[PDB]
Symmetry: C2
Amino acid sequence: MRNIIVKKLDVEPIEERPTEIVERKGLGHPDSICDGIAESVSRALCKMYMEKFGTILHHNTDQVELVGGHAYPKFGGGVMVSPIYILLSGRATMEILDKEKNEVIKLPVGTTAVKAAKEYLKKVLRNVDVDKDVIIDCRIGQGSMDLVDVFERQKNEVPLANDTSFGVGYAPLSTTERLVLETERFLNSDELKNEIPAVGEDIKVMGLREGKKITLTIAMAVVDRYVKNIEEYKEVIEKVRKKVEDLAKKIADGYEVEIHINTADDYERESVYLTVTGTSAEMGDDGSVGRGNRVNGLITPFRPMSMEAASGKNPVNHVGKIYNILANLIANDIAKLEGVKECYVRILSQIGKPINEPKALDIEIITEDSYDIKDIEPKAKEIANKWLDNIMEVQKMIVEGKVTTF
Amino acid sequence: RNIIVKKLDVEPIEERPTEIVERKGLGHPDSICDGIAESVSRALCKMYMEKFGTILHHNTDQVELVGGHAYPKFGGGVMVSPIYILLSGRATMEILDKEKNEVIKLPVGTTAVKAAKEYLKKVLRNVDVDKDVIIDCRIGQGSMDLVDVFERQKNEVPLANDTSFGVGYAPLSTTERLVLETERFLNSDELKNEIPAVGEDIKVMGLREGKKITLTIAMAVVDRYVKNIEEYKEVIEKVRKKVEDLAKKIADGYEVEIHINTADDYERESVYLTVTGTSAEMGDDGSVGRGNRVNGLITPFRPMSMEAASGKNPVNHVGKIYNILANLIANDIAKLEGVKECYVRILSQIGKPINPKALDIEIITEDSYDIKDIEPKAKEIANKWLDNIMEVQKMIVEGKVTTF
C-alpha cells in the first residue's frame, strides 16, 4: 500500500494538439558536454566508493563549467589555438575517520573525477585531442565522514528522503519528440560518421509542429579537415539533409516534413558553421550543467519539466534525480499497457520517509477510446509499485549507465 | 507574420487541485550567478556604448560559483575559505585598426570584474569582498560566425543569434504571487533595516493542495545580529508574522501555513546560521540558468524555457529577448475580458530578424466567451509588441526588467 493515485485525464494528448515545440542539445553541444561530464564523474565516484566500501558515500558533482577555447577554422585543415578550459566542481566524501581503529582512509576523489571527465570527452569528441585541446581543472570540495556513518550506509537500506522534492515523467514520445531525439542520435552514430566524417558532434535539433507539418531546424558543426572549400561544405549539408529526410520517412510518415540546416550560414561570404574539432566549445560557445536536456533527453515547453539538474547528483539520496528518472521509467511501462494513449507520472517525496514511499505518486492517463480507466488502473498501480519496490535496481541502472540524465 | 492562436479547454492553474512554485532569492548561490552574469552584460553594454556608440557582440551568461567554507557562531562567526567565482562567456576582446594594422584590446576584463564585485556588494550586505570572495575571469573572444550575424543588420533589425524559444504566461496564480512577493519583501531594504539579521539567501517553496497553501522558507540568518538561540527564534517568528501579514494581503480566502527553516534542530543547536548571509559560504555551489525564469519563478506546472536570460546580450539573443517578450505579450492578453489564462511561446530561426519562426498563443477562456472574439485581439497585441521589440531591448539595458 502506497500513496499511488490513478486519474483519467480528459484532455487531448500532445500528439493531437495543434502546435508543438521540442529541442535537443546533442552530445557535442557545450551544455550537454558539461551534463555528460557531471554524470560521468558521479558514476566514477560511485564505482570508487563501492570498490572500497561496498556502498556509495555522499557527493554531488552537478557543477561543471566549460570555458570556450580559441580556434581558427579553415577549409582543409584548421588550427586549435588555445585549449578548452573545463572546471570540475561540487562536493564529495574524501577522508573517512575511524576513531575505533584510530585510522584515516583517503579516497581518490580528485584524480578519479579528472580521469572520468577526460575519458568521457575521449569517447564523444572524435576530432579532439584531449592531451592538447582540453584543460580539465578540479575544485571539488573534498569533505570528511565518520566511519560509523559509513557502516550505517553499508547496510544499504532504502535511504530516507532528506527533502520534500518531486520528479515528473511521461510516455510515449510524440512523433515530433521522437523525430528530434532520433535525428540527434543518428547524426551522432558511428555508422553515419563513417559515411560523412565532416559531421561534428555539436548537433542541436529544434522541432516545430504546426498541425501535421513538422519543421526540423538543425545546427550542425562541420569538421573543417573534411571539407576543402565552400562547395564541399554545401555538399555535406545536402547529404545530411537527405539522410534526415530518409529518417523522417521512418518516424513521421504521414506528416509534411521540412528540414533546415545551419540557417545562419552565408554561403556567399563563406560565413558558415565551420569548426576545427566539430564542437563550438572550441571557441564559439561556453557551457555548464542543467541548462539543456531533461532526463528524457529533450527540452519540452509543451510538457511538464523539472528545473532541477539531474546530472552529477547523488543517485543514492537525491530525490530530484531519482524521481525524474523513476517517473519516466514508470510512465514508459504504463504506456505499454493496452488502452493507454498518453501517461503522465508525477512523484512527490515525504521528508523523513523512505524515497520509495512518496507522499504522492500521481498517474494521469489519457485513455484510448472505448477503454475503461478502471480496467487499466490496477495494472498501472502494480507497475508503479513494482518500480518502487525495486528502487535500488533503478539506482544500479544509473551507475551502470543503463539510464540517461540528459 | 506567423502568429498562432489556440483555445485551451482545461482548468486554469488557479483551479487545478495541486501546485508547486519555487523562487531562489537574491543571496542563493544560483541567483548570485544569474545576477552577476546580468551585471557583467549590462556593464559591457555601457562600456561598448561609451566607446563606439553601439553595443558589440558578447554573451556573459556563464558564471560558476564554487562554495567557500565558514564557521558560523552566535554573535559573529568567521569565514574560513573564500568563495571562488569564475566569470566566463564570450565578448569582443579586441578590434582591428586595419589602417595601423594593429590590434586594440578592449577593457572587458576590468569592466566584468568590477561589475561582479559591485553587484555582490549590493546583494550581500555582510560579505567582505576583499577576503570572503575570489572573482576570477576567463571571458574569451567569440567566434567569427556569430559576430557577423550580430553585425549583419544591427542598424536595422538584428538577426537572431540562434534557434531558440522563450515562454511566458499570465496572470500569476495566488501561490505564484505569494512565493514571488514573499522573497521580494524579505529582501527589500525596508525589512533589512528593520531586521538586519535576515540574510539574502532566501529560498521559498509554495505547495498548494486545493485551497491550502503551505509556504516553506529557507532563510539564512546573519550570525553577527543574533546573540543566542533565543534571539534567533525571535527573528524566525518576527519574519513569520510579517509573511503572514503579507499572505493576508495576497492570499485572501486561502488557508496559509508558513514554515521557516524546517531543518533546524534547536536541541543540538544546529540552525541556519551564516556569517555572510548566504549558503555559498558553506560549500553550496551555483551557476547560471539553474534557478528562476525571467518571471522570477520556478514552475513545473507551467511551461518553461531552458534558455538562461541572464548574461545574454539584449541586442540579438532571443534566449533573453523572447522570454521577456513572451511575458509582456501574455500580460496584455490576460487583461482582455474573457481571457482567464494566457500562454505565449515564441520560436526563432537563427539568421532571421528578431521581430519569429512562430509566435504561439494559448488561451483559457472564461466559460461564457468565444475564442473567435479574443483571437483577433490577441494577434494584434502580439504584432504591436513585435513592432516595438526594440523598446523591450531598451527596458532590459535600462534594467526596467529583470532576468531572474
